[PDB]
Design a protein around this motif. Structure first.
Motif, PDB file in Angstrom:
ATOM      1  N   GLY A  23       0.845  -1.075  -0.040  1.00 22.71           N
ATOM      2  CA  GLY A  23       0.025  -0.074  -0.073  1.00 22.71           C
ATOM      3  C   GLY A  23       0.623   1.291   0.070  1.00 22.71           C
ATOM      4  N   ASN A  27       0.619   3.828  -2.890  1.00 24.51           N
ATOM      5  CA  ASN A  27       1.019   5.314  -2.974  1.00 24.51           C
ATOM      6  C   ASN A  27      -0.367   5.953  -2.279  1.00 24.51           C
ATOM      7  OD1 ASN A  27       3.757   5.347  -3.729  1.00 24.51           O
ATOM      8  ND2 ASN A  27       3.053   5.509  -5.973  1.00 24.51           N
ATOM      9  N   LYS A  28      -1.111   4.966  -1.436  1.00 23.38           N
ATOM     10  CA  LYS A  28      -2.183   5.515  -0.730  1.00 23.38           C
ATOM     11  C   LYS A  28      -1.946   6.251   0.419  1.00 23.38           C
ATOM     12  CE  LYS A  28      -4.220   0.554  -1.289  1.00 23.38           C
ATOM     13  NZ  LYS A  28      -4.847   1.001  -2.557  1.00 23.38           N
ATOM     14  N   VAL A  85      -4.994   2.265   4.527  1.00 20.09           N
ATOM     15  CA  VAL A  85      -5.311   1.395   3.872  1.00 20.09           C
ATOM     16  C   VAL A  85      -6.243   0.570   4.774  1.00 20.09           C
ATOM     17  CG1 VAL A  85      -3.446  -0.127   4.592  1.00 20.09           C
ATOM     18  CG2 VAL A  85      -4.733  -1.003   2.711  1.00 20.09           C
TER      19      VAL A  85
END
Lengths: 80, 80, 150, 205, 129, 123
Positions: E16, E20-21, E24
């Motif tokens: 994640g 490139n969040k 999550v």
RNA sequence: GCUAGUAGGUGGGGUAACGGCUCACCUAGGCGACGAUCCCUAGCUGGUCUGAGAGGAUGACCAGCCACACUGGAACUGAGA
RNA sequence: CCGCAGAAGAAGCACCGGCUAACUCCGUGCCAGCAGCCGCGGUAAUACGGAGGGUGCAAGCGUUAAUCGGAAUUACUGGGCGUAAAGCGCACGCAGGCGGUUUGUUAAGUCAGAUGUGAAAUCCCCGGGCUCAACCUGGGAACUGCAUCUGAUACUGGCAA
């Protein structure tokens, strides 16, 4: 019946006895109960050649231990 | 402790003998994990007091007939 | 910023139309004594300029590692190619302990006390793939520390 | 053997100077170093890794006089002291009795000192000592004999030692030729023999 | 059907970062809460919030470095299929002398470091560093 | 792979079989001799190579290499086996050390004597 | 696939003592792929060697245990064979 | 341990084409033969044979056999399986293995401490005794273990809800 006795395990042309509790019905260097120190006749006071355990033995003797000429007289060399 | 194993019956086809099946978590040091190693044993019983699939308490004890040295102390339950 | 070395050295070939070339290409490393040290493939049809040209392309590269007191603080586990690369930290009493390519590249970068290992193919041309796997993969005291800066 | 073979010739085959059988009068004057040991000794090969390790090992190995078998025994004693076993290793090679005696100026040379240890010339305390593999104890009493300073060899063996650095971890004496091993050899008391890196590579195999 | 819940966490963390969040989602459970806690203290995850009021999910906020990720050592030492326990003095220190392993013990959920002189050893669940 | 599979079906480590069997399991062998031949070698490497079969005294009919130069070998000669092999000859897994037992060493060898026994000259 | 003193229950006898050890009767089970049974191989262990460890191989001398004593077999004595 | 002459009585073996430290010269010319492996040799052989020289080990050296390592080369630590060796042709499913989540409980697993016990020697740490070391040896640790006892309750397993 236990039998306290010497047992040389030291290298050639250099006795290193070992006062041990065994039984007399087994090998001198063989089967043992438990130790009660050492006897080195090669000590001459640059190291200590003995370990006493006076206490331990004193119990063992009542437990039916037997002492050989050497072992018996070796308590005597240091007295108390 | 009387060496108490919570086992599970797997055989009432005799009277006074009931085969109980128990396990310990045995580990392999080369598969490096515990598993279930189940070992049937031959217990000596008062008569019968259980069915099969009967969770019980058994104990060690004297021998008193061939391959006996465990006893039933009590039947925990028939089913959980 | 210099500390000349060579590593590997060998030959390669193309088939011209029936004749053959036999170009001498090879790996080197030039040190700086604190890291920032690369690698180069110095093709040369002849033997001497084969390391010449390599040491050129070394200057056209670098991988910075941070390390202290000749002992890389972070064990290596890294894998690129079929070359598995390893380095267990040894504070003292170890030299480099290596016969690989990863002997030389782990010295020149200022590195006088490490203990090392590899599994996989012995193929020296990618034994140098310890440079992704120990130079660029590193973990420094101040590195983790700026996670904790947060 | 004990070696004791054609000494200097190894200095030749490594191109590196040592006092071993040389004077202080001949320093490759009327003697030669490295001109060509053998008829192929002129030209220099690049050398594989194993090449370096072998040559370099033999460098350190011959300025104590030490054998293979001997050296391994040293390696398991080094790695049986808690310390840097690079240091521990070269510390124990400069723990050889023949060496400390030379490094207290009583040997002409490293080698000639051990000629002394052969005979009853060297001693520690009142005790006579003929074995050179003896790692002397912290604060020793490593004296020459009474009836050994009367020999013309021992007088002439303080002579050739003169005017050297004498890396100090020990005392250098001339009243009773009786020193003290008063601290151990160390990384600083190496005099550019820092090749601990090599042999610890060689040995670990 | 899940066989490891715990993987669901770790898997989506490394993924994640990579994705490139900035936080999550995956289903919570009691233990999982307490794992995200040590990470967070030590700094391994930004922060965390648990929406259980409807259906539990551990909305754990991802910490980034600058653009580079902070994941490099993420792996699960244990498994459901190789449940493990390492004693007080037979617990390995993980990756680096700078390493950090989330370690459960008889008291709580702790870490390599903490757990050690805390008189304890136990399950080393995972490690991040 | 998975542990529980191994718990049933343990992983091997070796099969316990040599590259080169010895067929008597020791350093050295008393073998007779069955035929002093000289065959041409396997693989093209064009030569004459002195071989001989030899019925070992504990059984096994095996074939041994003959080395050096000269011979003394007979059809009921009894040789000391070096053991070990060479390439380029197929049924040879065995080699004869000459200059041991009755058999003579190499006639006129003055270096690398140990290989193919023979005493150092007086000089 | 294996197992009739085979597996167990009763009651006798025997053994230094528990036990099909043995015996009479009764039940029809018991054991087995979580590997019985059968075959090959091997004295077994502390340990030894090697090895970074984990592990592997190995079990000479030194120590403990078991068995064996020309081969096969048997009991007697005695605290103990 | 003392004295006694006098260097006196006390160095060899293997290898040097590459792996691998260590080259030349002749003799022979796919013949002779070498050979751990890759391979040499059919006429200037750095690889054969002899010699000269050298390199490493040394009262031992080499060769062989044999074990383990290297070899993560059968992978618990420590592997792959799309095409390189390597996914049953495919389903269902008993046993076996594994088990979402919440509360409570138990404490079997597990962790801790406690207690026995893990023979001695071997081993290991410090430290002595043999002219030193080998060896021998003292105390301590290890003795990876096992069981029990008493505690712990996060997880794991068991039960209930």
């Amino acid at each position: 019946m236990v039998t306290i006795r010497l047992a040389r395990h030291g290298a050639k042309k250099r006795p290193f006895y070992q006062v041990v509790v065994a039984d007399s019905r087994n090998a001198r260097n063989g089967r043992f109960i438990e130790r009660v120190g050492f006897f080195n006749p090669i000590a001459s006071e640059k190291e200590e050649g003995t370990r006493l355990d006076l206490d331990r033995i004193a119990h063992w003797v009542g437990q039916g231990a037997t002492i050989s000429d050497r072992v018996a007289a070796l308590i005597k060399e240091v007295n108390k | 402790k009387i060496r108490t194993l919570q086992g599970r019956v797997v055989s009432d086809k005799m009277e006074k003998s009931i085969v109980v099946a128990i396990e310990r978590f045995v580990k392999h040091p080369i598969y490096g994990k515990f598993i279930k190693r189940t070992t049937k044993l031959h217990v000596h019983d008062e008569n019968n007091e259980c069915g099969i699939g009967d969770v019980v308490e058994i104990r060690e004890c004297r021998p008193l007939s061939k391959t006996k040295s465990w006893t039933l102390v009590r039947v925990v339950e028939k089913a959980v | 910023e210099l500390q000349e070395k060579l590593i590997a050295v060998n030959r390669v070939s193309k088939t011209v139309k029936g004749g053959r070339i036999f170009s001498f290409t090879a790996l080197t490393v030039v040190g700086d004594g604190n890291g920032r040290v690369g690698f180069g493939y110095g093709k040369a049809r002849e033997v001497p300029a084969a390391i010449q040209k390599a040491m050129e392309k070394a200057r056209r590269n670098m991988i910075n590692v941070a390390l202290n007191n000749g002992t890389l603080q972070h064990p290596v586990k890294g894998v690129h190619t079929g070359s598995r690369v390893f380095m267990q930290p040894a504070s003292e009493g170890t030299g480099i302990i290596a016969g690989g390519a990863m002997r030389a590249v782990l010295e020149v970068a200022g590195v006088h006390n490490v203990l090392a290992k590899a599994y996989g193919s012995t193929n020296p041309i990618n034994v140098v793939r310890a440079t992704i796997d120990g130079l660029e993969n590193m973990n420094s005291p101040e590195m983790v520390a700026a996670k904790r800066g947060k | 053997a004990r070696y004791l073979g054609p000494k200097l010739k190894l200095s030749r085959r490594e191109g590196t100077d040592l006092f071993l059988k040389s004077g202080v009068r001949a320093i490759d004057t009327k003697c030669k170093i490295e001109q060509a040991p053998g008829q192929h000794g002129a030209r220099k090969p690049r050398l594989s890794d194993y090449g370096v390790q072998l040559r370099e090992k033999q460098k350190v190995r011959r300025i104590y006089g030490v054998l293979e078998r001997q050296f391994r025994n040293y390696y398991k004693e080094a790695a049986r002291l808690k310390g840097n076993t690079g240091e521990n290793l070269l510390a124990l090679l400069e723990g050889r009795l023949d060496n400390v005696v030379y490094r207290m100026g009583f040997g002409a040379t490293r080698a000639e000192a051990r000629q002394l240890v052969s005979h009853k010339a060297i001693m520690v305390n009142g005790r006579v000592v003929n074995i050179a593999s003896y790692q002397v104890s912290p604060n020793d009493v490593v004296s020459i004999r009474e009836k050994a300073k009367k020999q013309s060899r021992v007088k002439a063996a303080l002579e050739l030692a003169e005017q050297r650095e004498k890396p100090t971890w020990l005392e250098v004496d001339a009243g009773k030729m009786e020193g003290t091993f008063k601290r151990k050899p160390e990384r600083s008391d190496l005099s550019a023999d820092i090749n601990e890196h090599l042999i610890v590579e060689l040995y670990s195999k | 059907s899940m066989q490891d819940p715990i993987a669901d966490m770790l898997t989506r963390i490394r993924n994640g970062q990579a994705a490139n969040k900035a936080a999550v989602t995956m289903p919570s459970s009691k233990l999982k809460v307490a794992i995200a806690n040590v990470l967070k203290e030590e700094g391994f995850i930004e922060d965390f919030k648990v929406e259980g009021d409807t259906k539990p999910e551990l909305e754990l906020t991802l910490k980034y470095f600058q653009g580079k990720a902070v994941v490099e050592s993420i792996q699960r030492v244990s498994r459901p299929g190789l449940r493990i326990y390492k004693r007080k003095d037979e617990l390995p220190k993980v990756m680096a002398g700078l390493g950090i392993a989330v370690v459960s013990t008889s008291k709580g959920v702790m870490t390599d470091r903490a757990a050690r002189q805390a008189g304890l050893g136990g399950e080393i669940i995972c490690y991040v560093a | 792979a998975t542990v529980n599979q191994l718990v049933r079906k343990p992983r091997a480590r070796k099969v316990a079989k040599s590259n080169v069997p010895a067929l008597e399991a020791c350093p050295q062998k008393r073998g007779v001799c069955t035929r002093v031949y000289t065959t041409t070698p396997k693989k093209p490497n064009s030569a004459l190579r002195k071989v001989c079969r030899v019925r070992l005294t504990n059984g096994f009919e095996v074939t041994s290499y003959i080395g050096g130069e000269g011979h003394n070998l007979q059809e009921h000669s009894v040789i000391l086996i070096r053991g070990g092999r060479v390439k380029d000859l197929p049924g040879v897994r065995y080699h004869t050390v000459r200059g041991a037992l009755d058999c003579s060493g190499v006639k006129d060898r003055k270096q690398a004597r140990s290989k193919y026994g023979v005493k150092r000259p007086k000089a």
